[PDB]
Amino acid sequence: MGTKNIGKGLTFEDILLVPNYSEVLPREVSLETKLTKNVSLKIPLISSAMDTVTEHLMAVGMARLGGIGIIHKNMDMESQVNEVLKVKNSGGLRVGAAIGVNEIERAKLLVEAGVDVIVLDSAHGHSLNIIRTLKEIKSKMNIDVIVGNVVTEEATKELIENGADGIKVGIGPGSICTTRIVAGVGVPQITAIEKCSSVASKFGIPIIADGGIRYSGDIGKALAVGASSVMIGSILAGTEESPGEKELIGDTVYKYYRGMGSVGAMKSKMVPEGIEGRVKYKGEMEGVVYQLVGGLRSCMGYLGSASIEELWKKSSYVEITTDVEIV
Amino acid sequence: MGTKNIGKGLTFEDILLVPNYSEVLPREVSLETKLTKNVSLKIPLISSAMDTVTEHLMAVGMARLGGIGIIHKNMDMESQVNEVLKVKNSGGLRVGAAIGVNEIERAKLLVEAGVDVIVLDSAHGHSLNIIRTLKEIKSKMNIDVIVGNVVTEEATKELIENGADGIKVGIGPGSICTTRIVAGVGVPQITAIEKCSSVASKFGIPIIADGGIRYSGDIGKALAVGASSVMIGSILAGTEESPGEKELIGDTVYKYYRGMGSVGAMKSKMVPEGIEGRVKYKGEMEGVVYQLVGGLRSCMGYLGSASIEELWKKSSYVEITTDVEIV
Amino acid sequence: AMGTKNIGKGLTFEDILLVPNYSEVLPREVSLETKLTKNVSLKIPLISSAMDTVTEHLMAVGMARLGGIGIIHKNMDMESQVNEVLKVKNSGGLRVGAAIGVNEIERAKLLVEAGVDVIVLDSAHGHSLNIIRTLKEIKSKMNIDVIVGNVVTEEATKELIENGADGIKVGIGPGSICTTRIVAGVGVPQITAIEKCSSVASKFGIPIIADGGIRYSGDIGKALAVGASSVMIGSILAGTEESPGEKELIGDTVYKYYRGMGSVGAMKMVPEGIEGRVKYKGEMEGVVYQLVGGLRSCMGYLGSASIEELWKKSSYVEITTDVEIV
Amino acid sequence: MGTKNIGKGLTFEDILLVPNYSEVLPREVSLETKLTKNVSLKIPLISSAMDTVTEHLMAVGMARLGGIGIIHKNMDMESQVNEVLKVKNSGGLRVGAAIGVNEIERAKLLVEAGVDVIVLDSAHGHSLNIIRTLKEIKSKMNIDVIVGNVVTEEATKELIENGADGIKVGIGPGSICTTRIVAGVGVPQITAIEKCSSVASKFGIPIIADGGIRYSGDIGKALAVGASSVMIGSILAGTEESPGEKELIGDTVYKYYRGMGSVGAMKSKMVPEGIEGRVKYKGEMEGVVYQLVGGLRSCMGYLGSASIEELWKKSSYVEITTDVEIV
Ligand SMILES: C/C(=N\OCCN)c1cccc(C(C)(C)NC(=O)Nc2ccc(Cl)c([N+](=O)[O-])c2)c1
Ligand SMILES: C/C(=N\OCCN)c1cccc(C(C)(C)NC(=O)Nc2ccc(Cl)c([N+](=O)[O-])c2)c1
Ligand SMILES: C/C(=N\OCCN)c1cccc(C(C)(C)NC(=O)Nc2ccc(Cl)c([N+](=O)[O-])c2)c1
Ligand SMILES: C/C(=N\OCCN)c1cccc(C(C)(C)NC(=O)Nc2ccc(Cl)c([N+](=O)[O-])c2)c1
Ligand SMILES: O=c1[nH]cnc2c1ncn2[C@@H]1O[C@H](COP(=O)(O)O)[C@@H](O)[C@H]1O
Ligand SMILES: O=c1[nH]cnc2c1ncn2[C@@H]1O[C@H](COP(=O)(O)O)[C@@H](O)[C@H]1O
Ligand SMILES: O=c1[nH]cnc2c1ncn2[C@@H]1O[C@H](COP(=O)(O)O)[C@@H](O)[C@H]1O
Ligand SMILES: O=c1[nH]cnc2c1ncn2[C@@H]1O[C@H](COP(=O)(O)O)[C@@H](O)[C@H]1O
């Protein structure tokens, strides 16, 4: 009854994947995927380009486990290049790096330093400035470019037309995100993946599902509705390999975790669109990633899918509504 | 299922605005709007006509920042006139003043005092007494009259036909409102703005979205579905410029904030339709208004809208369902 | 809706809001006169519940004086119930009701002889053989208006009316102290239940009593708006001084006992009500004043000068379900 | 709005049963039911095959009250056989026993020991391994086999065609279940029973509703939408007859209750799909079961159903939205 009402948006919590006939065990499924149309991964996990999540140590950790880390850009170009070189000089290991609009010089140095992918990011990926930066990169240098963040078919189509090698989806869903309350803007993440994958898959362009992952189950849901990989922040921020500081709040140890659109991140008249928060310290990332990969394998076993491509073809979900004390 | 069921009603929390292709930056958008058909504002913010929110200092503050304040009527005619004169005597600043049903004498004195707009208020705007008062004002004096509060198409049409220069929308959504629980009456504010805007827009008559604003994001939502401006109470009640008293509750400083239909406000056999509450002290209104305006600019940027006219044209929304500890 | 046994969405009071109409009537001007049964009228549409923590003679005298009516509960010997009814009648000839259960023909007889104005035939499941038999037997042996409940369906409403019901009490599920939903898994949301039952009863001119679930004055307006002629109230009145419930100090607050008639204590088993406590509210007149005031406000918003007009003009909208009150 | 969306899933809390005309009292209803196509029970209650719920003492209690207990498999074959023999030597009492995939030797020993039903269970019942194990059992020995857990029509149909004598439904609903959050997989239990019973009732094959029972009212709901019986874990875990350990926490006594997919159960590199929890100690199981049976009787009385078969015929439900302090 609303003219401007385009429908009901679903987030991860709104749905559950329905089991299929299965002939494959969790241990047997292949988790190989495409990061961009020219770069592959062994597992579909990416660490977020945030200054409390990913520098060289996190990037090295991610790559060793078959994923990839995106070096954040909240540092001068020289330091970012050096972080990339740190990962690259640690054996033949893939690594990514973030840039912002009009940062062509930063992009050039990164590419020279041997980065495998450039992540061109903005709060609003479907914009004139972003597209102009994209076209400039593709014409000046030889590199795969992931562009984001977008949530619509139209955005996805236009970015692909201008040379996007990967599409990053997510406005609204981040754990430290306040765009939804500051600007009133967003799209629930399942719906956003569905819309963007509906265009991108037609062109063989990978969708990165960015933000809102809380449990391993969410990874399965994101991939099932069309994503090729997921980008993760808060979960990895609590690990020993994250660059964030530590603080003892009362009894337990916490790691700092802040949005790149927070007051503190922007200092490194403002209208912040992210908070500065704390997450519980969780130790080594390897144990953390193992559980995440373990959960996804279990999911794909339930859906009888031996690969992500198969999962796209076989998956379906149900909408759900939203006395034992756990030890 | 019920014949009397007119459908599902949405409030601000129920929806999220969808991003469009954008070639305008937040800093570049124009927030100019019409308060009434003959009075314009530089920003679409109005402070509520309540005795804990708007007297002359709040009204001056709002006017200086491009908005307007409505002097409340919980005082003798002479006192209300003097408050208006205080705003008027400090630069050529705009100001409004509230009156109730049959208060023709008060309105006359306010108009003579140079008030820019009269706000004819009632719990139930769509009524015989309100219409009569409106017609009497329009025939005895020359001034723009805003009439409210209403939530239906029929109400909006009738008030416009009888000469209303602006329509104030909102029954149910105010933070201190108990009409919904005392009378069981109301309409969720997004739905109410849509219904009323569907009639008023072709007439070129501005809709004021009154009540329920908690975050800057809500302002964007209100304007996007048809409103020309928003009226705000509780957010401004906490500022140093509001007339409410201060109380120290344990650790933090609070300001009094009460509905004009509360027992205490009606004392200044009763059946109250508002509560007497407290809100945290927030300091200078300038910083508060800065954030609100900033959030709206962010919104219009996401929606590629360089003006409010453009926002009405381009906006769409999605209906939504309703680990990190903030520092 | 995907399930073959799914008959649709059920709405309770909290699920909806009444939409304002054009109004030419003030809250003070509306008439609250209504029918209790097709032969008994009331000045206000409020009934106090037939529970042993809510209504004995003092509550029933309170209700009647204010324009409503009280239903004396049946958790007492027959002679005792008659004496309560006689206490109400001895003071101004005020109207009063009384509850009976299935097969309690002797009790109904004594009550009618005592001058009761209406008999309330009550069961957990009103649409049953035993209830129908008792109803038919009453109508044939004595001359009295009989309210029957509780029911939630069109077919229940129709059959009870065809067997002589003078009023229909609607409510399975909504009571504040009710656990039928949890114990039996049974019930219908109260807005939907009133709509279904009134759709049948309005054709025969038989009043609907909306029983249970009232928390705020606004709920009264909603119930009447969708077809009810009156509402029955328990927990709100249970905290008043006129209620027969005991009082207990818990912490720094005085509480009144309030228990379901299907609770262990009331029956003294598979209980379908809880034993609870409600905050003490003082005299009932002030409480009833607020309730009536809120309903007047509602009828003013909906431009309805009477309950009849409210039935004709009312519509509602479905809704989704940092100012700190002093 | 989503193509892979198969609809809204309902759990127990989402519905309420609608009363029918009744000519039967709660005390008059028959609770007799089929456990499998060749085994009948006096009441439709089964205790879960978990090591904190059912060993011989629980199984004897369930049998004497008219139901049945399923001896868990987290013990050696000889120990499980010994538990079965303990129940059989306590008079002619029904008893069941659980096996996993490929546990043909275990099944043979249990059958030779006089077990009345084999419960072939897996996290994902609709799989190649489960089907092969089923066909192997049916071909090598003579016993009724209950197979689970499944949530779909296709799964139900295939297991039945391959010789299942009972179908256990439930992926998602258990009180200690985290398959939902670890794998992102599940189906709300009312919907799951509906889908599976739509197939199984055509073949006269009983549906067991497994998991998520919290109140007696839930049993009525499960049977009403097509189940022949319900399996219960958490409710019975707190009884004196459960094998769980006891522990004082504060001033209240708790019993241990853990998923069989918990790390604690699998110890008796893990990716658990159940939690380790505690439930309040509730004394003898007899009083507990009495309330559940009484609740179901009350339900069938409301629905005018003198038997479960009649309940299937007459039942309907409504979908619902989801100041008195209890003593
Ligand atoms: C929200 C955000 N990042 O989010 C990542 C995707 N969820 C973020 C990161 C750093 C700074 C900021 C800040 C600077 C706080 N805010 C924005 O940039 N907001 C914004 C609003 C509308 C538009 Cl159209 C544009 N734009 O680039 O043209 C930007 C935000
Ligand atoms: C609720 C309210 N204001 O709300 C502002 C808009 N949300 C308010 C303010 C002062 C006094 C009151 C009081 C006096 C407490 N309440 C009403 O006036 N209620 C009301 C109900 C229905 C009608 Cl039909 C009429 N009417 O005069 O025609 C009035 C309420
Ligand atoms: C639930 C209830 N009253 O509710 C009033 C309306 N909500 C109540 C009052 C006293 C005792 C009880 C008790 C005795 C606790 N429970 C029932 O009577 N339950 C019940 C269930 C199904 C049927 Cl079919 C019948 N029946 O008489 O035919 C009765 C309940
Ligand atoms: C979840 C569960 N039981 O649930 C009972 C019914 N809800 C459970 C019990 C013991 C171990 C486990 C463990 C071992 C923790 N997890 C699984 O077995 N998970 C799983 C995932 C997908 C598949 Cl395709 C299969 N499989 O049948 O090969 C198994 C889980
Ligand atoms: O300040 C911000 N505001 C909104 N989103 C942000 C901000 N900073 C980072 N993000 C996004 O949030 C994601 C992480 O989401 P999380 O894993 O749910 O913590 C990142 O990959 C970014 O896309
Ligand atoms: O007592 C009352 N009851 C209901 N609404 C009120 C009352 N007093 C003021 N209002 C409305 O509530 C608005 C403020 O809502 P808020 O900004 O959400 O606090 C005012 O502009 C009035 O329209
Ligand atoms: O024990 C019980 N179980 C269920 N309903 C009850 C029980 N006792 C009283 N009731 C109902 O609950 C109504 C009161 O509801 P309340 O006003 O919401 O407290 C009564 O008028 C009865 O219809
Ligand atoms: O570890 C587990 N993960 C998920 N489900 C489990 C696990 N262990 C047992 N279950 C299921 O949960 C049921 C008990 O559900 P409850 O009665 O709601 O506690 C059992 O009968 C099993 O079907």
CA distance D254 to chain C (A): 24
Distances (CA, A) of D94 to D117, D128, D168: 9, 30, 18
Distances (CA, A) of B313 to B111, B124, B298, C145: 36, 30, 17, 62
- Are B3 and B309 a contacting pair, CB within 8 Å? no
Both structure tokens of C62: 């309170």
> How far is CA C161 from its chain centroid?
18
Angstrom distance (rounded) from CA C189 to CA D250: 39
Cis peptide before C150 (omega within 30 of 0): yes
Cis peptide before D149 (omega within 30 of 0): yes
Q: Which residues contact A91 (CB under 8 A, 6 or more apart)?
A: none
What's D1-327's CATH class? alpha beta
Name the β-bridge partners of B207: B167
Q: Cβ C276–D220 below 8 Å, yes or no?
A: no
By C-alpha distance, the chain C residue nearest D214 is: C182
Site of tokens 């017609």: B135
> Phi/psi at A325 (nearest 5 deg)?
-80, 120
Hey, which residues 273-312 in chain D have their CB within 8 Å of chain A?
273, 275-279
Cβ neighbour number for residue D269 with a 10 Å cutoff: 6
Documented resolution in Å = 2.1
- C1-326 topology per CATH: TIM Barrel (3.20.20)
Q: Which atom of ligand 6 is nearest to the CA of B272?
A: 1
Hey, which residues 217-276 in chain D have their CB within 8 Å of chain C?
217-221, 224-225
Q: Cβ B324–A276 below 8 Å, yes or no?
A: no
Name the β-bridge partners of A127: B22
DSSP D205: P
Mutation pick from A12, A18, A31, A296 vs chain D, by most beta carbons of D within 10 Å, is A18
- Are A1 and B187 a contacting pair, CB within 8 Å? no
> Phi/psi at B12 (nearest 5 deg)?
-60, -40
Q: Is A299 a catalytic residue?
A: no
Name the β-bridge partners of D52: none
Q: Cβ B2–C325 below 8 Å, yes or no?
A: no
Nearest CA residue ID for atom 11, ligand 8: D174
Query: Annotated catalytic residue: which of D177, D223, D237, D292?
Result: D177
Both structure tokens of D252: 């209240």
* Nearest alpha-carbon partner for C35 in C150, C204, C193, C159: C204
Both structure tokens of A235: 């979960």
By C-alpha distance, the chain A residue nearest B322 is: A322
Helix (H) or strand (E) holding B40: strand B39-41
Q: Cβ A22–D127 below 8 Å, yes or no?
A: yes
Q: Which residues contact B109 (CB under 8 A, 6 or more apart)?
A: B77, B80, B81
Characterize A216-245 residue by residue with b for buried, 16 or more Cβ atoms within 10 angstroms of its Cβ, and e for exposed: bbbbbbbbbbbbbbbbbbbbbbbbbbbbbe
Q: Which of D19, D225, D324 sits opposite C258 (nearest CB)?
A: D324
DSSP letters for C112-124: HHTT-SEEEEE-S
Site of tokens 């095959």: D49
Q: Is C150 an 8 Å CB contact of chain D?
A: no
Angstrom distance (rounded) from CA B230 to CA A125: 29
* Nearest alpha-carbon partner for A197 in A230, A161, A145, A157: A157
**Burial (0-12, 13-18, 19+ Cβ within 10 Å), D260:** buried
Dihedral sign, Cα of residue D198, residue D199, residue D205, residue D209: negative
Judging contacts by C-beta atoms under 8 Å, the chain A residues touching residue D1 are 7-10, 191, 194
Judging contacts by C-beta atoms under 8 Å, the chain B residues touching residue A14 are 321
Angle of helix C57-65 versus helix C284-301 axis, rounded to 10: 40
* Helix locations, D115-178, DSSP H: 128-140, 153-161
- Are B210 and B169 a contacting pair, CB within 8 Å? yes
Q: Is A208 an 8 Å CB contact of chain D?
A: no
Angstrom distance (rounded) from CA C12 to CA C194: 10
Site of tokens 């256990």: D168
Query: Annotated catalytic residue: which of B177, B230, B232, B279?
Result: B177
Ranges of beta strands (E only) in D116-261 are 117-121, 144-150, 166-169, 207-210, 229-232, 246-249, 252-258
Q: Cβ A19–D128 below 8 Å, yes or no?
A: no
**Burial (0-12, 13-18, 19+ Cβ within 10 Å), C214:** buried
Judging contacts by C-beta atoms under 8 Å, the chain B residues touching residue A4 are 194, 224-225, 315-317
Nearest CA residue ID for atom 21, ligand 3: D298
Q: Which atom of ligand 6 is nearest to the CA of B233?
A: 17
DSSP letters for B48-100: -S-TTT-SHHHHHHHHHTT-EEEE-SSS-HHHHHHHHHHHHTSSS---EEEE-
Site of tokens 């004002």: B137
Q: Backbone dihedral region of A119: left (phi > 0), alpha (psi from -120 to 50 degrees) or beta?
A: beta
- Are A125 and A148 a contacting pair, CB within 8 Å? yes
Angstrom distance (rounded) from CA A223 to CA B27: 37
Angstrom distance (rounded) from CA D158 to CA D203: 12
Q: Which of C156, C189, C276 sits opposite D318 (nearest CB)?
A: C189
Helix (H) or strand (E) holding A120: strand A117-121
Ranges of beta strands (E only) in D48-99 are 68-71, 96-99
Angle of helix A77-88 versus helix A104-113 axis, rounded to 10: 20
| Residue C51 CA, ligand 3 centroid: distance in Å | 14
Strand order in the sheet with B5-8: B5-8, C316-318, C16-18
Cβ neighbour number for residue B38 with a 10 Å cutoff: 12
* Nearest alpha-carbon partner for C66 in C289, C298, C244: C289
**Burial (0-12, 13-18, 19+ Cβ within 10 Å), D27:** exposed
User: Helix or strand or coil: residue A235?
Assistant: helix
Mutation pick from D320, D322, D326 vs chain C, by most beta carbons of C within 10 Å, is D320
For residues B235, B236, B238, B241, the Cα torsion angle rounded to the nearest 10 degrees is: 170
Judging contacts by C-beta atoms under 8 Å, the chain C residues touching residue B275 are 323, 325
User: Helix or strand or coil: residue C163?
Assistant: coil
* Nearest alpha-carbon partner for C126 in C99, C95, C157, C97: C157
Angstrom distance (rounded) from CA D235 to CA A287: 34
Ligand 8 contacts CB of residue D262 (under 6 A): yes
Touching partners of D (3+ C-beta pairs < 8 Å): A, C
Angstrom distance (rounded) from CA A299 to CA A304: 9
Query: Annotated catalytic residue: which of C11, C178, C295, C302?
Result: C178
Dihedral sign, Cα of residue C32, residue C36, residue C39, residue C40: negative
DSSP A230: E
By C-alpha distance, the chain A residue nearest B219 is: A184
Angstrom distance (rounded) from CA D46 to CA D210: 9
Angstrom distance (rounded) from CA D243 to CA D237: 8
Q: Is D52 an 8 Å CB contact of chain A?
A: no
Ligand 3 pocket: which residues have CB below 6 Å? C 123-125, 128, 150, 171-172, 175, 178, 180, 212, 261-262, 271-272; D 22, 25-26, 298, 301-302
Angstrom distance (rounded) from CA D206 to CA D219: 15
Q: Is C182 an 8 Å CB contact of chain B?
A: no
- Are C148 and C165 a contacting pair, CB within 8 Å? yes
Ligand 1 contacts CB of residue B19 (under 6 A): no
Name the β-bridge partners of B34: B40
**Burial (0-12, 13-18, 19+ Cβ within 10 Å), D104:** middle
Both structure tokens of A318: 């149900």
Helix, strand, coil % over all residues of chain D, rounded to 5: 35, 25, 40
Angstrom distance (rounded) from CA D220 to CA D316: 12
Greatest Cα pair distance, chain C, in angstroms, is 62
Q: Cβ B187–C23 below 8 Å, yes or no?
A: no
Q: Which of A1, A6, A128 sits opposite B317 (nearest CB)?
A: A6
Angle B116-B118-B124 (CA atoms, 0-180°, nearest 5)? Answer: 155
Q: Cβ D4–A317 below 8 Å, yes or no?
A: yes
In one-letter notation, the amino acid at residue A6 is: I
Ligand 6 contacts CB of residue B230 (under 6 A): no
Nearest CA residue ID for atom 8, ligand 8: D259
Q: Are strands B276-280 and D39-41 parallel, antiparallel or unpaired?
A: unpaired
- Are C183 and D216 a contacting pair, CB within 8 Å? yes
Tell me how long chain B is.
Answer: 327
Q: Are strands B207-210 and B229-232 parallel, antiparallel or unpaired?
A: parallel
Give the closest ligand to the alpha carbon of residue A149. Answer: 1
Angstrom distance (rounded) from CA D116 to CA D40: 10
End-to-end Cα, chain C, rounded Å: 45
Q: Which residues contact D166 (CB under 8 A, 6 or more apart)?
A: D35, D36, D37, D117, D144, D145, D146, D147, D205, D206, D207, D208
* Nearest alpha-carbon partner for B227 in B200, B259, B203, B264: B200
In one-letter notation, the amino acid at residue A295 is: G
User: Helix or strand or coil: residue A33?
Assistant: strand
| Residue A123 CA, ligand 5 centroid: distance in Å | 10
Q: Is A204 an 8 Å CB contact of chain B?
A: no
- Are B228 and B250 a contacting pair, CB within 8 Å? no
Angstrom distance (rounded) from CA C269 to CA C253: 32
- Are B160 and B187 a contacting pair, CB within 8 Å? no
Q: Is A213 an 8 Å CB contact of chain D?
A: no
Helix (H) or strand (E) holding B263: helix B263-267
Angstrom distance (rounded) from CA B49 to CA D217: 52
Binding site of D for IMP, by residue number, is 175, 210-212, 233-234, 257-261, 273
Ranges of beta strands (E only) in C187-322 are 208-211, 230-233, 247-250, 253-259, 275-279, 316-318
CA distance B241 to chain A (A): 20
DSSP A91: S
Name the β-bridge partners of C278: C256
Angstrom distance (rounded) from CA B11 to CA B19: 19
